[PDB]
Amino acid sequence: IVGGYTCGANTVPYQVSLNSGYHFCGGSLINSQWVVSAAHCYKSGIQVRLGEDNINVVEGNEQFISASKSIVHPSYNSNTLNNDIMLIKLKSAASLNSRVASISLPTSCASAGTQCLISGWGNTKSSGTSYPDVLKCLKAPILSDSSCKSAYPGQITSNMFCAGYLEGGKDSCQGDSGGPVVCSGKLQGIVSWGSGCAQKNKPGVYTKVCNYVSWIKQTIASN
């Protein structure tokens, strides 16, 4: 997260870190057994880390639980990033309390202009590289479809929305991928792609979770 703020420990209790020997992506806990992340975060051997603030220090509220299975969206296209969503099942249920909690799926799609909360352990620099230890947060509005399309001509599908700041300075970045965009208390987006971080006229692009609720519910009912 570039241009954001320190969230505060366990103030984003649905935020997970995906670890394969190192942090590589975020995710969102949607019930005691399931995480939603980006399909471009897929890999084998995932350990889900819940209850994290500093990802480099064991502070006392963590739960580390291995994934038993991952399910990439059946129509994910890694070229276009259309349908950039994945479900990850935990080998054992998480214990839910104030420091670890699920986030609700949306009922309706979020509105242009709505401020949302984006979070992650990704790079904090637009130019160059610096990774934080503690979870970072960013308040960012959803942009109009027309401004999103103008920023990325020919690339925005109905399964994507833009959020952030056309002037630059404030955005998600590498290592935030797969993490949450929460608007009005519901999971509306997944950190998906863009062109760099915090560059002018290149806002972040987010998977539009409201399009996927049916697939999520059906999948978790059978796996």
Residue set of the binding site for Ca(2+): 52, 54, 57, 62
Residue 40 designated active-site: yes
Q: Candidates 33, 159, 177, 207: give the one binding ligand NCc1ccccc1 (CB under 6 A).
A: 177
Question: Is the CB of residue 179 less than 8 Å from the CB of residue 118?
Answer: yes
Near ligand NCc1ccccc1 by CB under 6 A, which window of 13-21, 45-53, 170-178, 208-216?
170-178
Residue number, 32 or 54, with CB nearest to Ca ion: 54
Please report whether residue 116 would count as binding ligand NCc1ccccc1 according to CB under 6 A: no
With CB under 5 to 8 Å by kind, the binding choice for 204 among Ca ion, ligand NCc1ccccc1, none is ligand NCc1ccccc1
DSSP 103-171: -BPPSSPPPTT-EEEEEES----SSS----SS-EEEEEEBPPHHHHHHHSTTT--TTEEEES-TTSS-B
- Which uninterrupted H or E stretch holds 63? strand 63-72
Query: How far is Cα 223 from Cα 217, in angstroms, rounded to an integer?
Result: 10
Q: Per rule CB under 6 A, is residue 138 in the interface with ligand NCc1ccccc1?
A: no
74, 113, 128, 154: residue in contact with ligand NCc1ccccc1 (rule CB under 6 A): 154
